[PDB]
């Protein structure tokens, strides 16, 4: 029987943390900071998708170009395979073609 | 697994409460129960 007997330890949360209290701050820097910076410089993540949306395939492509040369062989290979697959899936297999 | 089901037992019960009084597996085994229950309905 999958369901469990003892109800979990109560997940206490501080909504007034240093993160959540100052969430969204500066985000909106340009429109009232004479456009020194863009809010796409605020976003901190992977170097390839840093102010750039994308698809799955597109993302993969981006990764391959911007990082590829400094990727782990095995991982690179996997990425390549994915790209190969993804292209096939998009450009051929599907509905509405 | 992101988001998988926790409230499954309840769903099963929701069918099985009607099969309670049948003969055989039908009253226990959900797969069989459901078919019987629907027919009854």
């Amino acid at each position: 029987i999958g369901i469990r007997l003892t109800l979990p330890p109560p997940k206490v949360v501080d909504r007034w943390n240093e993160k959540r209290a100052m969430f969204g701050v500066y985000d909106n820097i340009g429109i009232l900071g004479n456009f020194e910076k863009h809010p796409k410089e605020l976003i901190r993540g992977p170097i390839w998708l840093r102010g750039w949306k994308g698809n799955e395939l597109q993302r993969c492509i981006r990764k391959r170009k911007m990082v590829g040369s400094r990727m782990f062989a095995d991982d690179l290979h996997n990425l390549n395979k994915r790209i190969r697959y993804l292209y096939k899936h998009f450009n051929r297999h599907g509905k509405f073609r | 697994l992101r988001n998988r089901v926790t409230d499954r037992y309840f769903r099963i019960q929701e069918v099985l409460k009607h099969a309670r009084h049948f003969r055989g597996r039908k009253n226990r085994c959900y797969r069989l129960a459901v078919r019987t229950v629907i027919r009854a309905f």
Binding site: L7, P8 | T6, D7, Y9
Partner: peptide, 26 residues
Amino acid sequence: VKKGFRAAFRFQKELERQRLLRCPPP
């Protein structure tokens, strides 16, 4: 160990109900 809480709560309630049905108070 699944991620929820509501389901667990419901189950607890059910259990309680069952208990009540079984060995009720005076």
